Amino acid sequence: LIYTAGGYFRQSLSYLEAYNPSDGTWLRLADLQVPRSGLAGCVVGGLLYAVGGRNNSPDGNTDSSALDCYNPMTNQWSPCAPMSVPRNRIGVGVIDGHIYAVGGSHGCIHHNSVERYEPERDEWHLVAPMLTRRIGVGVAVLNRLLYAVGGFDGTNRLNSAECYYPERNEWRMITAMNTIRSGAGVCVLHNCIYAAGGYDGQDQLNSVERYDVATATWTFVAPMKHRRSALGITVHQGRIYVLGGYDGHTFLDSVECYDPDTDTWSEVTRMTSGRSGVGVAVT
């Protein structure tokens, strides 16, 4: 199922809801213990993780350094060790069963730092920083390499992307995207890195482009129906699913689905309530 955790509508949310693309059902599961938006989600060893974010509420606006783990067999959240700094609008990718936390903000500070979590030791350790400060950064893993794509450096929104080599622990810039995108959905489908939607400083985007490693080229594919930034994104059964977001006026419940073979986006479901800034993963 596609799990979405957290998000924002009027305040940061605790929701954990799981969608079944088979029967179209929405399952409601255990609440996050602390609300959070601008987090990221991943899955390691069959356990679902919620990383960073912040709790934006009527009584505070606290950036989160928290790492929290949901077991689909127990329906229970458990705390893990926290990151070295709070990271709102974080990006995460999974390499070799390790969780990489990328960028994000703490107050005015826009991080270029990166750190790596070892689930079997429940510890974080800092790795090499990105070349660019990036919040609202999209992160994807391809051929055991970590890509940081787009985002916002505190002043400029970014079309640049860079690549992390775990064996050499160093970052290398790659070809920039055709479009500047902060708060896009960034995943890997088959063997391209996809960047969908985002915000370019003036408008939310519906365009979608994909990166081909061998040619180092970004190409546009079919656009989504609805422009959106701060969306969740995941891959389910060779399909791309994007969930919610913000279009400059409204918080979307729309869930769109990209069929790569037809190069077509379809409306597949609505979330139970519109929201932005969710964390999403599959298990």
Binding site: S37, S229, Y246, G277
Partner: peptide
């Protein structure tokens, strides 16, 4: 509002 996420700033 944050123009990107919709959150109250």
């Amino acid at each position: 509002l944050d123009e990107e996420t919709g959150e109250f700033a």
